[PDB]
């Protein structure tokens, strides 16, 4: 349906083919397929917000040619 | 500094899939075949096509 | 370290993260100032938050020292500006950049960890009364970050 | 299929040497640092910078 | 196999080797004819040697069948044109191409192995009387390859 | 002193820095350093002629910007 971009940890940009109804879990599964990064090590950021696994691209107003930012799993304490 | 401009060329065996099947032997590896073709070589107990060292393992290689 | 730090500085000029900027204080490439704008819709909105960054001599094998200079109301950041965040300690990666660290810190603002807090009193208020948490964070943003 | 165009970009750590230090973990490898920097990561007890899997071995990678 | 064979054929068309040529016999991509010029300084000098190449269906995992059509005097090549050469059998590599095989066969002409021969009578003459070996090889070159 | 070329097994061409007095053994050691191929599995060819380990580049009249052809070690039988 639409292309979205992911700026990966190294600054490499990859293209995903997605539906707005796709779960964040499915986007991380696609990143694992392209990059060999386990989902549990992926933290995706859009508009400064971390993207939660059970929510969808549409839930974060992620549209055609939006760029998701991939950082490493982190824990504040 | 010598950069691998040939890394983007397809698997030298099947001429289709990317060079993502690294042939590992000790502390060195030869990356010139895809994972599928490399796994065929390992499965049939064939040595490295380029240096003839025995194949320790095939590594699905990403450029993150 | 110096060539890697130069590369990160060039990346920040060309393509910075939306709410995040960083650059050397003066002559010293190992001492940077950074800014995070308060994320939209957060109680930090309209706020500008300054940080200091000290790169170690063996960067990027060792993490940068990052601390807030601007006071901020948050369970994982104290009044001295110390950030208790695993990627600044044992879970650092040499593949992380200042750009990715500032984006990571920005995401910590919108989604705190109250369960293992640096400031227990703030964590308690976050869990029990989110609107009170947001009110105090908004008051601190107006008072200290404008 | 899509090929690794980023393969000719320098080691992400030292920003100088080629990506010839493959970080191996199980059946996969991440190639984004030189052999020198990769040996420093293993020596200093670091996991994979990109996926945090333990570094099983560093492989000096040639592109025949 | 077909795509790899096509790729090799395109390389031979685009960048032809000086003393080696190879291409399909008509419309069967798995059956080629090749020519090798007699190496300079060898008793094969000024000779053109025709070979047949049959690619197996699982090329390049399995070697091509290569045989001389032109008669040639050599301890490791019989009068049926069979080449007893390790890279055509157990020491084949899928990284070898027809180009590299023909170059390899050309180097076998200048560097015979009489100790483990295909033709013992020719090996005996090679070891005992090199000038006689060279005379006979030169006569066969004139008779068959010119 | 001078640069020579090697057309490696895949058809990739590499550059060596050599002396005409260099042993074929040393040239194979340099190929091992650049391409990770053990000398004992290297066969170098320069006029349809194999280059022997104990001889020199000068013994085969190999000059500035000559191209050596690398195939796999072979044996007739
Ligand atoms: Zn393949
Ligand atoms: Zn090898
Ligand atoms: Zn490096
Ligand atoms: Zn990894």
XYZ file of C-alpha atoms and ligand atoms in Angstrom:
578
model
C 0.000 0.000 0.000
C 2.645 2.596 1.132
C 6.450 2.858 1.727
C 7.891 4.028 5.106
C 11.599 4.626 5.948
C 13.600 3.412 8.996
C 16.858 5.247 9.882
C 18.689 2.228 11.460
C 21.258 2.497 14.316
C 24.210 3.151 11.891
C 22.242 5.882 9.982
C 21.568 3.483 7.044
C 18.009 4.141 5.700
C 15.882 1.106 4.611
C 12.432 1.059 2.903
C 9.512 -1.093 4.199
C 6.270 -1.911 2.275
C 3.490 -1.650 4.943
C -0.268 -1.137 5.575
C -1.361 1.644 8.015
C -3.054 -1.228 10.005
C 0.339 -3.079 10.455
C 1.318 -3.650 14.146
C 4.666 -2.181 15.402
C 5.468 -5.891 16.196
C 5.170 -6.698 12.422
C 7.408 -3.666 11.464
C 10.119 -4.977 13.929
C 9.737 -8.517 12.395
C 10.371 -6.903 8.937
C 13.448 -5.022 10.350
C 14.733 -8.391 11.757
C 14.305 -9.937 8.223
C 16.228 -7.030 6.511
C 18.869 -6.277 9.240
C 19.079 -9.351 11.599
C 18.195 -7.206 14.686
C 16.055 -9.139 17.235
C 12.740 -7.278 17.882
C 13.442 -7.127 21.697
C 16.592 -4.981 20.873
C 14.582 -2.577 18.599
C 13.203 0.716 20.006
C 11.370 2.610 17.192
C 10.826 6.413 17.662
C 8.431 8.735 15.706
C 7.782 12.402 16.782
C 9.976 11.663 19.875
C 7.561 8.879 21.052
C 8.664 5.199 21.477
C 6.325 2.955 19.344
C 4.581 0.151 21.363
C 4.381 -3.421 19.923
C 0.548 -3.948 20.074
C -0.299 -0.557 18.413
C -0.435 0.185 14.616
C 1.325 2.676 12.254
C -2.072 4.525 11.880
C -2.237 4.952 15.744
C 0.883 7.261 15.496
C -0.317 9.103 12.305
C 2.578 7.414 10.372
C 1.728 8.083 6.665
C 3.300 7.560 3.166
C 7.125 8.209 3.276
C 7.236 8.823 7.096
C 10.697 8.067 8.657
C 10.833 5.877 11.833
C 14.056 6.239 13.924
C 15.611 2.956 15.228
C 17.662 3.130 18.482
C 18.653 0.294 20.883
C 16.360 -1.133 23.607
C 16.914 1.191 26.631
C 15.791 1.267 30.299
C 15.549 4.433 32.438
C 16.154 3.821 36.183
C 42.399 1.331 2.746
C 40.904 -0.930 0.068
C 37.108 -0.934 -0.098
C 35.012 -3.839 -1.480
C 33.352 -2.286 -4.623
C 32.612 -5.921 -5.749
C 30.460 -6.519 -2.555
C 27.327 -5.249 -4.474
C 27.823 -7.806 -7.360
C 25.578 -10.926 -7.206
C 26.565 -14.426 -5.924
C 29.262 -15.761 -8.377
C 27.450 -19.204 -8.474
C 23.702 -18.391 -9.042
C 24.348 -14.812 -10.432
C 21.019 -13.684 -8.800
C 21.087 -13.373 -4.956
C 23.366 -10.988 -2.981
C 26.765 -11.967 -1.424
C 25.302 -12.686 2.083
C 26.633 -16.287 2.650
C 30.081 -15.784 4.266
C 32.309 -18.928 4.085
C 34.140 -19.007 7.476
C 37.416 -20.970 8.047
C 39.412 -20.164 11.236
C 39.807 -16.357 11.675
C 39.106 -15.604 7.929
C 36.091 -15.692 5.572
C 35.409 -15.426 1.801
C 32.182 -13.509 0.907
C 31.325 -14.080 -2.808
C 28.244 -16.431 -2.690
C 24.670 -16.100 -1.303
C 23.573 -17.983 1.874
C 21.556 -20.546 -0.229
C 24.532 -21.536 -2.497
C 26.963 -21.461 0.500
C 24.653 -23.822 2.531
C 24.631 -26.255 -0.485
C 28.507 -26.307 -0.416
C 28.616 -26.861 3.418
C 25.830 -29.553 3.245
C 27.830 -31.512 0.551
C 31.126 -31.175 2.567
C 32.754 -29.058 -0.211
C 35.685 -26.745 0.649
C 35.841 -22.945 0.038
C 35.552 -22.374 -3.769
C 38.317 -19.660 -3.692
C 40.966 -20.941 -1.152
C 39.980 -24.684 -0.673
C 40.088 -24.382 3.188
C 37.365 -26.608 4.748
C 34.089 -24.701 5.505
C 33.834 -24.259 9.341
C 30.392 -22.543 9.032
C 28.190 -20.404 6.713
C 27.252 -17.001 8.265
C 24.184 -15.073 6.972
C 25.995 -11.692 6.649
C 24.229 -8.304 7.110
C 25.729 -4.814 6.441
C 23.821 -2.872 9.154
C 37.902 9.366 18.762
C 38.381 12.807 17.071
C 37.507 11.613 13.495
C 34.363 9.765 14.775
C 33.295 12.900 16.795
C 33.855 15.111 13.648
C 31.702 12.592 11.631
C 28.862 12.826 14.258
C 29.086 16.685 14.257
C 28.757 16.715 10.399
C 25.702 14.318 10.707
C 24.045 16.792 13.186
C 24.586 19.775 10.769
C 23.229 17.785 7.736
C 20.370 15.731 9.286
C 19.677 16.364 13.013
C 16.876 14.548 14.910
C 13.682 16.746 14.932
C 13.866 18.106 18.549
C 17.679 17.666 19.183
C 20.868 19.731 18.424
C 24.487 19.404 19.726
C 27.931 20.932 18.980
C 31.300 21.772 20.633
C 31.201 24.452 23.435
C 34.266 26.314 22.012
C 37.716 25.009 20.883
C 37.260 21.570 22.611
C 35.796 18.828 20.296
C 35.496 16.537 23.425
C 33.116 19.013 25.265
C 29.676 19.639 23.618
C 26.452 21.425 24.579
C 23.131 19.866 23.411
C 19.482 21.074 23.412
C 16.272 18.957 23.491
C 13.033 20.919 22.765
C 10.153 19.646 24.963
C 8.247 16.985 22.932
C 4.857 18.177 21.499
C 1.841 17.303 23.780
C 4.195 16.440 26.754
C 4.235 18.716 29.858
C 7.753 19.753 28.596
C 6.190 21.441 25.462
C 7.560 25.021 24.940
C 10.649 24.105 27.039
C 14.291 24.058 25.845
C 16.547 21.693 27.886
C 20.370 22.164 27.772
C 22.753 19.200 28.363
C 26.577 18.946 28.675
C 28.386 16.121 26.778
C 31.985 15.051 27.661
C 33.433 12.470 25.199
C 36.054 10.167 26.795
C 39.485 9.792 25.041
C 38.528 6.195 23.904
C 35.057 7.206 22.508
C 33.152 5.445 21.031
C 34.262 2.293 22.996
C 33.232 4.181 26.210
C 29.954 6.169 26.472
C 29.777 9.990 26.512
C 29.034 11.587 29.943
C 25.602 13.302 29.400
C 23.799 15.416 32.073
C 20.992 18.054 31.967
C 22.030 21.634 32.900
C 18.311 22.703 32.702
C 16.218 21.532 35.732
C 13.471 19.039 34.634
C 10.735 17.142 36.582
C 11.231 13.406 35.725
C 11.589 10.159 37.761
C 14.873 9.093 35.973
C 16.591 12.573 36.069
C 17.569 14.289 39.401
C 17.964 18.062 40.202
C 21.774 17.725 39.597
C 20.841 16.713 35.988
C 22.112 13.089 36.344
C 20.303 10.768 33.823
C 19.944 7.162 35.132
C 19.740 5.405 31.718
C 21.356 2.020 30.857
C 22.692 3.183 27.388
C 24.861 5.792 29.257
C 26.329 2.909 31.405
C 26.685 -0.922 30.851
C 24.267 -1.007 27.817
C 26.263 1.595 25.801
C 27.007 0.579 22.145
C 29.792 2.128 19.999
C 27.166 2.174 17.142
C 25.105 4.740 19.182
C 25.805 8.411 18.256
C 25.053 11.699 20.146
C 22.133 12.066 17.645
C 20.714 8.609 18.689
C 21.469 9.251 22.426
C 19.570 12.623 22.332
C 16.647 10.941 20.444
C 16.764 8.103 23.075
C 16.722 10.670 25.988
C 13.831 12.562 24.240
C 11.829 9.229 24.165
C 12.630 8.729 27.931
C 10.881 12.132 28.630
C 7.557 10.959 26.992
C 7.673 7.457 28.672
C 9.455 7.477 32.080
C 10.332 4.336 34.173
C 8.763 4.916 37.646
C 9.345 1.247 38.776
C 13.181 1.630 39.245
C 13.384 5.426 39.744
C 16.261 7.905 40.393
C 13.712 10.188 42.243
C 11.226 7.966 44.176
C 8.908 10.897 45.200
C 8.431 11.865 41.477
C 7.867 8.152 40.525
C 5.139 7.840 43.257
C 3.300 10.948 41.837
C 3.733 9.624 38.218
C 2.027 6.266 39.105
C -0.790 7.592 41.421
C -1.732 11.017 39.860
C -0.600 11.521 36.194
C -2.467 14.902 35.954
C -0.585 16.144 39.112
C 2.729 14.811 37.633
C 1.891 16.689 34.356
C 0.908 19.914 36.271
C 4.256 19.949 38.234
C 6.307 19.046 35.066
C 4.492 21.912 33.191
C 5.210 24.365 36.104
C 8.935 23.327 36.134
C 9.024 23.700 32.277
C 7.656 27.325 32.549
C 9.890 28.151 35.585
C 13.251 26.615 34.425
C 13.157 25.795 30.626
C 11.774 29.088 29.093
C 16.839 -8.722 -4.672
C 18.752 -5.846 -3.043
C 22.504 -5.573 -2.646
C 24.651 -3.959 0.123
C 25.489 -0.483 -1.373
C 26.722 0.567 2.149
C 29.475 -2.178 2.001
C 32.067 0.384 0.642
C 31.387 2.930 3.489
C 34.141 2.942 6.166
C 34.170 1.197 9.598
C 31.478 3.026 11.715
C 33.946 3.190 14.712
C 37.288 4.474 13.218
C 35.654 6.021 10.043
C 38.843 5.046 8.066
C 39.340 1.276 7.373
C 37.050 -1.010 5.293
C 34.212 -3.148 6.798
C 36.290 -6.417 6.896
C 35.772 -7.399 10.616
C 32.596 -9.564 10.601
C 30.979 -9.986 14.086
C 29.611 -13.596 14.231
C 26.769 -14.674 16.621
C 24.950 -18.008 15.992
C 24.045 -18.368 12.265
C 24.334 -14.563 11.538
C 26.991 -11.833 11.317
C 26.985 -8.000 11.370
C 29.639 -6.436 9.076
C 30.005 -2.676 9.840
C 33.471 -2.424 11.562
C 37.068 -3.190 10.401
C 38.969 -6.252 11.799
C 41.126 -3.940 14.047
C 38.078 -2.259 15.728
C 36.186 -5.635 15.901
C 39.193 -7.220 17.758
C 39.097 -4.199 20.189
C 35.326 -4.904 20.832
C 35.983 -8.648 21.546
C 39.153 -7.863 23.644
C 37.177 -5.247 25.721
C 34.339 -7.734 26.392
C 31.682 -5.884 24.253
C 28.663 -7.590 22.593
C 27.635 -6.766 18.948
C 27.245 -2.935 18.720
C 24.126 -3.346 16.458
C 22.118 -6.311 17.964
C 23.815 -6.843 21.443
C 24.234 -10.641 20.773
C 27.546 -11.888 22.296
C 30.559 -11.833 19.886
C 31.196 -15.575 19.180
C 34.158 -14.724 16.856
C 35.606 -11.947 14.613
C 36.158 -13.075 10.961
C 38.637 -11.185 8.718
C 36.310 -11.001 5.657
C 37.670 -10.998 2.048
C 35.480 -10.229 -1.037
C 36.900 -12.426 -3.863
C 23.126 -23.407 -14.308
C 21.783 -21.545 -17.405
C 22.177 -18.011 -15.868
C 25.810 -18.776 -14.723
C 26.650 -20.218 -18.219
C 25.069 -17.090 -19.893
C 27.143 -14.837 -17.527
C 30.405 -16.685 -18.507
C 29.481 -16.477 -22.259
C 28.809 -12.667 -21.949
C 32.251 -12.226 -20.200
C 33.957 -14.155 -23.101
C 32.117 -12.013 -25.764
C 32.890 -8.679 -23.944
C 36.545 -9.400 -22.906
C 37.984 -12.228 -25.085
C 41.094 -14.070 -23.790
C 44.079 -13.839 -26.239
C 44.703 -17.599 -26.883
C 41.338 -19.125 -25.653
C 37.804 -18.936 -27.215
C 34.581 -20.831 -26.281
C 30.862 -20.614 -27.221
C 27.732 -22.796 -27.666
C 27.422 -25.357 -30.536
C 24.188 -23.967 -32.120
C 21.247 -23.532 -29.674
C 22.334 -25.928 -26.812
C 23.825 -23.595 -24.096
C 25.074 -26.775 -22.245
C 27.300 -27.904 -25.234
C 30.238 -25.556 -26.170
C 33.216 -25.772 -28.560
C 36.542 -24.201 -27.415
C 39.922 -23.481 -29.100
C 43.341 -23.137 -27.361
C 46.432 -21.914 -29.268
C 49.599 -23.998 -28.607
C 51.575 -22.171 -25.857
C 54.662 -20.193 -27.072
C 57.990 -22.141 -26.657
C 56.077 -25.498 -26.231
C 56.181 -28.213 -28.963
C 52.433 -27.283 -29.458
C 53.442 -23.749 -30.698
C 51.455 -22.529 -33.774
C 48.851 -25.306 -33.185
C 45.084 -24.691 -32.736
C 43.415 -27.367 -30.538
C 39.600 -27.846 -30.622
C 37.856 -29.077 -27.412
C 34.234 -30.004 -26.551
C 32.654 -28.697 -23.284
C 29.487 -30.362 -21.846
C 28.091 -28.455 -18.803
C 26.138 -30.712 -16.391
C 22.599 -29.562 -15.319
C 23.986 -28.703 -11.787
C 26.949 -26.575 -13.109
C 28.822 -24.919 -11.481
C 28.566 -27.287 -8.429
C 29.737 -30.117 -10.791
C 32.633 -29.651 -13.268
C 32.243 -29.312 -17.063
C 33.259 -32.401 -19.139
C 36.234 -31.113 -21.249
C 37.935 -33.259 -23.957
C 40.323 -32.524 -26.881
C 38.824 -33.125 -30.386
C 42.264 -32.392 -31.970
C 44.788 -35.240 -31.309
C 47.638 -34.071 -28.971
C 50.789 -35.861 -27.654
C 50.829 -35.545 -23.792
C 51.177 -37.979 -20.828
C 47.919 -36.737 -19.120
C 45.735 -36.633 -22.337
C 44.859 -39.889 -24.240
C 44.016 -40.384 -27.986
C 40.251 -40.284 -27.040
C 40.999 -36.644 -25.938
C 40.256 -37.411 -22.223
C 42.153 -34.984 -19.875
C 43.115 -36.624 -16.515
C 43.351 -33.379 -14.483
C 42.304 -32.993 -10.803
C 40.354 -29.672 -11.360
C 38.069 -31.546 -13.877
C 37.315 -34.167 -11.122
C 37.631 -34.172 -7.250
C 39.518 -30.768 -7.099
C 36.861 -28.849 -9.150
C 35.728 -25.473 -7.647
C 32.471 -23.655 -8.580
C 34.627 -20.432 -8.671
C 36.525 -21.872 -11.724
C 35.124 -20.631 -15.110
C 35.594 -22.068 -18.670
C 38.105 -19.167 -19.149
C 40.165 -20.311 -16.081
C 39.774 -24.044 -17.023
C 41.129 -23.404 -20.594
C 44.035 -21.315 -19.127
C 44.619 -24.191 -16.606
C 44.628 -26.826 -19.460
C 47.070 -24.586 -21.465
C 49.412 -24.611 -18.372
C 49.062 -28.484 -18.163
C 50.537 -28.657 -21.752
C 53.800 -26.853 -20.628
C 53.922 -28.766 -17.235
C 53.026 -32.486 -17.693
C 52.929 -35.039 -14.801
C 54.672 -38.242 -16.052
C 54.756 -39.833 -12.508
C 50.944 -40.583 -12.447
C 50.274 -40.711 -16.220
C 47.129 -41.349 -18.333
C 49.450 -42.661 -21.161
C 52.403 -44.584 -19.603
C 54.285 -44.971 -22.975
C 54.309 -41.123 -23.432
C 55.359 -40.639 -19.732
C 58.326 -43.079 -20.251
C 59.533 -41.042 -23.323
C 59.008 -37.720 -21.399
C 61.265 -38.893 -18.484
C 64.040 -40.669 -20.542
C 64.304 -38.491 -23.741
C 62.768 -34.949 -23.478
C 64.060 -33.959 -26.979
C 62.350 -37.112 -28.472
C 59.124 -36.281 -26.508
C 59.313 -32.686 -27.919
C 60.029 -33.978 -31.514
C 56.925 -36.315 -31.442
C 54.708 -33.569 -29.829
C 55.906 -31.119 -32.577
C 55.149 -33.742 -35.338
C 51.604 -34.333 -33.895
C 51.123 -30.491 -33.732
C 52.068 -30.174 -37.490
C 49.991 -33.287 -38.474
C 46.753 -32.548 -36.477
C 46.669 -28.887 -35.235
C 47.951 -26.791 -38.249
C 59.717 -0.591 -7.319
C 56.923 -1.614 -9.798
C 53.165 -2.470 -9.780
C 51.865 -5.729 -11.399
C 48.227 -6.967 -11.772
C 46.731 -10.366 -10.777
C 43.413 -11.455 -12.390
C 42.110 -13.508 -9.392
C 39.911 -16.638 -9.685
C 36.611 -14.594 -9.888
C 38.048 -12.227 -12.583
C 38.561 -9.424 -9.995
C 41.911 -7.621 -10.710
C 44.204 -6.606 -7.752
C 47.492 -4.560 -7.711
C 50.756 -5.802 -6.068
C 53.884 -3.717 -5.201
C 56.859 -6.047 -6.103
C 60.592 -6.166 -7.053
C 61.660 -8.108 -10.210
C 63.934 -10.110 -7.771
C 60.858 -11.242 -5.679
C 60.408 -15.070 -5.506
C 57.065 -16.461 -6.837
C 56.688 -17.761 -3.199
C 56.752 -14.084 -1.963
C 54.178 -12.954 -4.650
C 51.802 -15.778 -3.466
C 52.412 -14.656 0.201
C 51.349 -11.096 -0.894
C 48.216 -12.559 -2.632
C 47.461 -14.464 0.653
C 47.746 -11.113 2.589
C 45.350 -9.290 0.150
C 42.855 -12.157 -0.650
C 43.318 -14.903 2.053
C 44.287 -17.712 -0.436
C 47.004 -20.101 0.899
C 50.106 -20.109 -1.403
C 49.972 -23.960 -1.832
C 46.482 -23.565 -3.530
C 47.707 -20.699 -5.859
C 48.875 -21.363 -9.475
C 50.091 -18.155 -11.261
C 50.168 -18.154 -15.142
C 51.890 -15.458 -17.349
C 52.197 -16.921 -20.934
C 50.239 -20.195 -20.556
C 53.296 -21.059 -18.332
C 52.920 -21.797 -14.567
C 55.272 -19.718 -12.325
C 57.440 -21.964 -10.019
C 57.890 -21.043 -6.292
C 61.746 -20.878 -6.107
C 62.109 -18.694 -9.277
C 61.736 -14.847 -9.543
C 59.453 -12.424 -11.503
C 62.556 -11.423 -13.604
C 63.030 -15.153 -14.595
C 59.647 -14.887 -16.517
C 60.389 -11.383 -18.001
C 57.470 -9.961 -15.885
C 57.724 -6.114 -16.245
C 55.877 -2.965 -14.955
C 52.032 -3.435 -15.251
C 52.263 -7.118 -16.400
C 49.048 -9.137 -15.612
C 49.546 -12.519 -13.831
C 46.549 -14.941 -14.104
C 45.602 -16.752 -10.843
C 43.967 -20.215 -11.138
C 43.703 -22.991 -8.493
C 46.629 -25.385 -7.836
C 46.175 -28.277 -10.332
C 47.913 -31.619 -11.109
C 47.692 -33.749 -14.275
C 47.379 -37.531 -13.720
Zn 23.955 -17.998 -5.031
Zn 38.010 -19.357 1.595
Zn 37.662 0.487 12.430
Zn 25.018 -8.332 15.681
